[PDB]
Amino acid sequence: PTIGQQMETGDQRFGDLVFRQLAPNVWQHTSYLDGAVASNGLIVRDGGRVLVVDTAWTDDQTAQILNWIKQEINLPVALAVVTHAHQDKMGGMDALHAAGIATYANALSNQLAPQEGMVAAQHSLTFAANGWVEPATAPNFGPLKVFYPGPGHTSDNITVGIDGTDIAFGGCLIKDSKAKSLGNLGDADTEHYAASARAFGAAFPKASMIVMSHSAPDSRAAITHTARMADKLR
Ligand SMILES: [Zn+2]
Ligand SMILES: [Zn+2]
């Protein structure tokens, strides 16, 4: 890929997607769109069900995520949560709905989805003033702990911690510590980006593996480095 990590030992190719185990019950899914840009999301095994964070870029790619789950985990997918209304995170909604999978997004992501050319999720998350999801709107999310950090990469971007692990997912908000820019800022809130990145760090203070949309997993320095680049936008 031109944007995105390269394939590495421990990675499994399945169709045109790549899967990597990060923990006993957690995998990263990676899909590509043309050069090629990689996009990452997560798959979590929770008891007798599977939870998905983010679609792939397309419906066909997202169907392949479901196929890989069937082969390698062989448990039903109970729900998916998508972290904002752009193609890399929500482009494959139709595959989930075709399969009868309950889908969740920030209410604002669902409201923006038609303007962004995305299919809205079936259910909407809302958030307290401190950024934590209102639990009534996140039914049976199990280990997925959803946090809205504030506007940054987009106004609707949300983040997800995996309870019982050292993993937190920053989506497109967080860039890795070797990044030379903040990526695609076309819909970004440059005034609040830096504070939102720091808020993500403070919401998951013990996470040591930070998973991101367009880089391999990094340490907590990714959060600080992102916030310090965002400081220069103001
Ligand atoms: Zn985006
Ligand atoms: Zn992105």
From Swiss-Prot:
SMART domains: Lactamase_B
Domain of life: Bacteria
The protein's enzyme class: hydrolase
Binding-site residues, Zn(2+) 2: D88, C172, H214
One Pfam family of this chain: Lactamase_B
Record entry for activity regulation: Inhibits by captopril, thiorphan, dimercaprol and tiopronin. This enzyme is not susceptible to inactivation by the beta-lactamase-blocking agents clavulanic acid.
Subcellular localization(s) per the UniProt record: Periplasm
Chain residues that bind substrate: K175, N184
Comment on bound cofactor: Binds 2 Zn(2+) ions per subunit.
Keyword Zinc among record annotations: yes
CDD domains on file: NDM_FIM-like_MBL-B1
Cofactor: Zn(2+)
Molecular function, one GO term: zinc ion binding
Swiss-Prot/TrEMBL catalytic activity: a beta-lactam + H2O = a substituted beta-amino acid
InterPro entries linked: Metallo-B-lactamas, NDM-1-like, RibonucZ/Hydroxyglut_hydro
GO CC annotation terms, alphabetical: periplasmic space
Enzyme Commission identifier(s): 3.5.2.6
Keywords noted in UniProt: Antibiotic resistance, Hydrolase, Metal-binding, Periplasm, Plasmid, Signal, Zinc
UniProt main location, coarse: periplasm
Residues bound to Zn(2+) 1: H84, H86, H153
Described function: Confers resistance to the different beta-lactams antibiotics (penicillin, cephalosporin and carbapenem) via the hydrolysis of the beta-lactam ring. Does not confer resistance to the polymixin colistin or the fluoroquinolone ciprofloxacin.
Family: Belongs to the metallo-beta-lactamase superfamily. Class-B beta-lactamase family.
SUBUNIT field: Monomer.
Further comment found in the protein's record: Enterobacteriaceae carrying this gene (identified by PCR) have been isolated in Sweden, India, Pakistan, Bangladesh, England, Scotland, Northern Ireland, Australia and the USA. The organisms they were identified in were K.pneumoniae, Enterobacter cloacae, E.coli, Proteus spp, Citrobacter freundii, Morganella morganii, Providencia spp and Klebsille oxytoca. In India most isolates were from community-acquired infections rather than hospital-acquired infections, indicating the gene is widespread in the environment.
Name listed for the protein in its UniProt record: Metallo-beta-lactamase type 2
UniProt source species: Klebsiella pneumoniae
